[PDB]
Amino acid sequence: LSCSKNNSHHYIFVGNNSGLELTLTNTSLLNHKFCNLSDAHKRAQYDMALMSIVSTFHLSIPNFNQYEAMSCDFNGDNITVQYNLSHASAVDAANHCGTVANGILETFHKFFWSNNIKDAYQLPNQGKLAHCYSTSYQFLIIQNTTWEDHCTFSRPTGT
Ligand SMILES: *[C@@H]1O[C@H](CO)[C@@H](O)[C@H](O)[C@H]1NC(C)=O
Ligand SMILES: *[C@@H]1O[C@H](CO)[C@@H](O)[C@H](O)[C@H]1NC(C)=O
Ligand SMILES: *[C@@H]1O[C@H](CO)[C@@H](O)[C@H](O)[C@H]1NC(C)=O
Ligand SMILES: *[C@@H]1O[C@H](CO)[C@@H](O)[C@H](O)[C@H]1NC(C)=O
Ligand SMILES: *[C@@H]1O[C@H](CO)[C@@H](O)[C@H](O)[C@H]1NC(C)=O
């Protein structure tokens, strides 16, 4: 379940009956390291998902040429994105500051959706103060799912 006491979670409405469930968790959903966006249609569903999060959360992601370890999978049109977060220490957070995952951590922290996030490091970048968040959560999961089902993980791939 996304809505478990050992998790932290939030739902974003994006469509008419669609949205994104965001879950900080220690349960891995995707146990492969790849994210196959060879399909231009899948590339488009991936970009739209990340775009909805950035715009809904008014994120400004600093450009540190950094990257969050990540995999994805599709169940029909439903996307699953998993980040394997490198945010355990203040220095890990700093080295993973310019990522969408960090901006999501920033948002969970800002709105008290988790007690397990710290603003661990700040640094000037292009005239703005970037904040880099540490968390003990190992994974951040993004799934396209409905409000009615947002508390239950969807199956990452079909059968
Ligand atoms: C998740 O795992 C990390 C790393 O082992 C641990 O420090 C943390 O307490 C765990 N969080 C929960 C909610 O179990
Ligand atoms: C979190 O709690 C749920 C429900 O008790 C359990 O199924 C799950 O295994 C727990 N998470 C981890 C990482 O053990
Ligand atoms: C994330 O961690 C899981 C479990 O440790 C692993 O199976 C998976 O390959 C990892 N994914 C990435 C993108 O590193
Ligand atoms: C979520 O899935 C529905 C179909 O299940 C799809 O129409 C919609 O575009 C998806 N949302 C995205 C990709 O943001
Ligand atoms: C995808 O998600 C939609 C709602 O988000 C759901 O109705 C559907 O059963 C899911 N799976 C597939 C294969 O479309």
Residue numbers in the entry: 82 to 240
Text lifted from the article:
The GP1 subunit of the envelope-displayed arenaviral glycoprotein spike complex (GPC) mediates host cell recognition and is an important determinant of cross-species transmission. Maturation of the GPC precursor involves proteolytic cleavage of the polyprotein into a retained and myristoylated stable signal peptide (SSP), a GP1 attachment glycoprotein, and a membrane-anchored GP2 fusion glycoprotein (1–5). We solved the crystal structures of the GP1 glycoproteins from Loei River virus (LORV), an Asiatic rodent-borne OW arenavirus of unknown pathogenicity in humans, and Whitewater Arroyo virus (WWAV), an NW arenavirus associated with spillover into human populations in North America. Both WWAV and LORV GP1s were solved at neutral pH (7.5 to 8.0) and acidic pH (5.6 to 5.0), permitting the first direct analysis of the effect of pH on the structure of GP1 in the absence of cognate GP2.
LORV GP1 crystals were generated under both neutral (pH 8.0) and acidic (pH 5.0) conditions, and X-ray diffraction data were collected to 2.5- and 2.0-Å resolution, respectively. Neutral- and acidic-pH-derived LORV GP1 structures were solved by molecular replacement, using the crystal structure of GP2-free LASV GP1 as a search model. Structural overlay analysis revealed that the two LORV GP1 structures are highly similar (0.7-Å RMSD), indicating that pH does not modulate the conformation of isolated GP1. In contrast to the structural differences observed between WWAV GP1 and other NW arenaviral GP1 glycoproteins, LORV GP1 exhibits a high level of structural conservation with other OW arenaviral GP1 glycoproteins in GP2-free states, where superimposition of LORV GP1 with LASV GP1 and Morogoro virus (MORV) GP1 resulted in a remarkably low overall RMSD (approximately 0.8 Å and 0.7 Å, respectively). In contrast to WWAV GP1, however, the structure of LORV GP1 is distinct from that likely presented on the trimeric GPC and equivalent to previously reported acidic pH structures of LASV GP1 (16) and MORV GP1 (17) in GP2-free states, which present α-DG-incompetent binding surfaces. We note that residues known to interact with α-DG in LASV GP1 are fully conserved in LORV GP1, indicative of shared receptor usage. For example, in contrast to the close spatial association of critical binding residues (H141, N146, F147, and Y150) in the GP2-associated state of LASV GP1, H139 from LORV GP1 is displaced by more than 15 Å from the nearest other predicted binding site residue (N144). Similar to previous structural analyses of LASV GP1 and MORV GP1 (16, 17), the spatial delocalization of these receptor-binding residues in LORV GP1 is consistent with the structure constituting an α-DG binding-incompetent conformation formed following detachment from GP2 during host cell entry.
